[PDB]
Amino acid sequence: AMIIADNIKQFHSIRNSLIKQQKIGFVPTMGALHNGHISLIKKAKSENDVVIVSIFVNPTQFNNPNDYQTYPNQLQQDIQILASLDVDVLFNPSEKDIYPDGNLLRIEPKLEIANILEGKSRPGHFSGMLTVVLKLLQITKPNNLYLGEKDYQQVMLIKQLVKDFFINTKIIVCPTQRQPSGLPLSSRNKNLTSTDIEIANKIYEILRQDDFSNLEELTNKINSTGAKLQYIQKLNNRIFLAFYIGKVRLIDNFLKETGPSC
Amino acid sequence: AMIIADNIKQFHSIRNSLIKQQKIGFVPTMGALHNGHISLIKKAKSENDVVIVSIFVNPTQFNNPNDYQTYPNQLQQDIQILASLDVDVLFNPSEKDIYPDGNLLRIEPKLEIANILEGKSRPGHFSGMLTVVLKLLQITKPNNLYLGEKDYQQVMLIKQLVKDFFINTKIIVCPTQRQPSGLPLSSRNKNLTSTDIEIANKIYEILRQDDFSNLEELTNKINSTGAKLQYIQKLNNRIFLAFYIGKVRLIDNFLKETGPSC
Numbered sequence: 166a167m168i169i170a171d172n173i174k175q176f177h178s179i180r181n182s183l184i185k186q187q188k189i190g191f192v193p194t195m196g197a198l199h200n201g202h203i204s205l206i207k208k209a210k211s212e213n214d215v216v217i218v219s220i221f222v223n224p225t226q227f228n229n230p231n232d233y234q235t236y237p238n239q240l241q242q243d244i245q246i247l248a249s250l251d252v253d254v255l256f257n258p259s260e261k262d263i264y265p266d267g268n269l270l271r272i273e274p275k276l277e278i279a280n281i282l283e284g285k286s287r288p289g290h291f292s293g294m295l296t297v298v299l300k301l302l303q304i305t306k307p308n309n310l311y312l313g314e315k316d317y318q319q320v321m322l323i324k325q326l327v328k329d330f331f332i333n334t335k336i337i338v339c340p341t342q343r344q345p346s347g348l349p350l351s352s353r354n355k356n357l358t359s360t361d362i363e364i365a366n367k368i369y370e371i372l373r374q375d376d377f378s379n380l381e382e383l384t385n386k387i388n389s390t391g392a393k394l395q396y397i398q399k400l401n402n403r404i405f406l407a408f409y410i411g412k413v414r415l416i417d418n419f420l421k422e423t424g425p426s427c
Numbered sequence: 428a429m430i431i432a433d434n435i436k437q438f439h440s441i442r443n444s445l446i447k448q449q450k451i452g453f454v455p456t457m458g459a460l461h462n463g464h465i466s467l468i469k470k471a472k473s474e475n476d477v478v479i480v481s482i483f484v485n486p487t488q489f490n491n492p493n494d495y496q497t498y499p500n501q502l503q504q505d506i507q508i509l510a511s512l513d514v515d516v517l518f519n520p521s522e523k524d525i526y527p528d529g530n531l532l533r534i535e536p537k538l539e540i541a542n543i544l545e546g547k548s549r550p551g552h553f554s555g556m557l558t559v560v561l562k563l564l565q566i567t568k569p570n571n572l573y574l575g576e577k578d579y580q581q582v583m584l585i586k587q588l589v590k591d592f593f594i595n596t597k598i599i600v601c602p603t604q605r606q607p608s609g610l611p612l613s614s615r616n617k618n619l620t621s622t623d624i625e626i627a628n629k630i631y632e633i634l635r636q637d638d639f640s641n642l643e644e645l646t647n648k649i650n651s652t653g654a655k656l657q658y659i660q661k662l663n664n665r666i667f668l669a670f671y672i673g674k675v676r677l678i679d680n681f682l683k684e685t686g687p688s689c
């Protein structure tokens with residue numbers, strides 16, 4: 166029963182056939198679905214008459230070509246998961262569907278939250294993300310949008326986006342799903358080798374032991390595991406960090422008081 | 428009977444009260460209405476059940492502070508004009524209405540048409556224009572948008588905007604209204620003194636006699652009136668130009684074969 170729309174034309178037809186009365190929920194993703202994504206879909210199914218999920222590996226938000234080339238890809242498994250969850254529509258457009266004439270008009274964020282942390286570490290990422298989310302919102306026109314708290318800055322930027330361009334959509338932020346160790350679920354973690362996972366687990370044991378009073382020292386404890394910390398910052402009541410293990414880039418954020426708790 | 432909506436809440440009210448049967452025409456402007464604007468309004472009226480006119484002097488598109496400070500302002504006269512045209516809704520928002528948190532998210536054009544002529548001459552103008560136009564379109568959600576050919580690059584850019592962000596609005600381009608001399612009608616014209624007016628007319632007496640085979644000599648003739656030419660160029664089969672008379676910056680474009688006729 167799941168409808169799979171491989172292109173915009175088909176999708177428009179599908180979208181135009183829904184009555185205003187139906188609550189429409191939307192979950193944007195770049196595929197390679199895990200329990201994090203699934204938690205978002207489950208929330209949206211509990212609150213909407215119609216749930217749409219997108220799968221689109223957005224080229225304009227990849228500041229790193231290798232990251233892009235190696236981004237995990239398993240459409241058939243993804244479809245199987247979405248059908249299992251009774252998702253109503255899968256929108257899985259091509260690049261040319263979303264950027265008919267290339268990336269000519271971009272949303273450019275000019276504010277502090279864009280300039281720090283992920284913004285600083287991934288130049289041009291937030292522009293690409295904001296531009297594709299705006300286009301995906303204009304296409305799907307949902308009542309409700311589901312986002313993970315893991316991408317904390319992304320959440321706050323999309324909130325600003327929906328506010329500034331008068332998009333009549335409610336935003337629902339969902340807690341970060343984690344492994345028992347505390348490591349957040351992430352599609353890139355599929356790229357982690359055997360030993361890398363143990364390293365990731367080392368790090369989260371360190372994080373669950375730490376009071377975050379000495380970031381230089383914690384940085385040193387994290388770097389000794391073999392990982393390479395990119396940044397760690399205490400921002401109000403929340404810790405933000407990002408690091409590499411081998412070629413894999415992992416990010417996280419959590420309440421200082423809780424740690425990456427279960 | 429014209430409804431004047433000086434804020435979003437007030438505008439959402441009236442907008443949301445319209446039935447789908449009613450074709451909505453939208454004419455955005457920055458106020459100080461002249462026969463140029465009036466022709467667009469008349470076209471919209473002949474083609475729609477509901478006509479909306481906005482008046483909003485958008486600060487983010489003025490690259491020149493003095494230009495912004497002196498930009499003509501005459502809201503009461505504008506209101507009288509619109510009312511005699513039986514315009515259904517005046518949308519006249521404040522800066523705060525349009526930019527609740529300032530100019531934090533901007534549409535940035537990365538393409539050729541934005542990099543030449545007016546785009547090069549007015550750095551950051553097209554970004555301002557596209558951002559406010561996107562907002563206005565998201566607010567008004569019209570069926571038909573009316574734009575003047577005089578702002579040629581603006582038209583092309585707005586067509587790209589409507590395409591890229593999936594706005595279901597038709598764009599109607601309208602002929603440039605002119606003084607008997609050929610001088611385009613423009614709001615900034617109200618800032619011209621009497622002697623400025625005569626320089627402007629001399630420029631157009633020159634243009635009407637020209638074949639444009641030699642822009643160098645044409646530039647010298649225009650500069651000899653006391654005006655200061657910014658640029659003059661052939662793009663495709665049109666002539667594009669912009670010039671200052673005193674502190675007043677005016678632009679024009681027309682087919683090379685016809686010149687600024689009428």
Ligand SMILES: Nc1ncnc2c1ncn2[C@@H]1O[C@H](COP(=O)(O)O)[C@@H](O)[C@H]1O
Nearest residue numbers: 194195201312313316340341342349350
């Ligand atoms: N481990 C997680 N827990 C909760 N939400 C997540 C998790 N990972 C990704 N998401 C959210 O899923 C959506 C798509 O993520 P991605 O496919 O990684 O771009 C975004 O709203 C993410 O923040």
Ligand SMILES: Nc1ncnc2c1ncn2[C@@H]1O[C@H](COP(=O)(O)O)[C@@H](O)[C@H]1O
Nearest residue numbers: 456457463574575578602603604611612
């Ligand atoms: N002389 C004119 N003839 C036709 N349209 C015009 C003229 N001057 C301005 N417009 C259009 O009126 C709209 C508002 O212009 P403005 O208020 O100058 O920003 C734009 O679509 C302009 O291109």
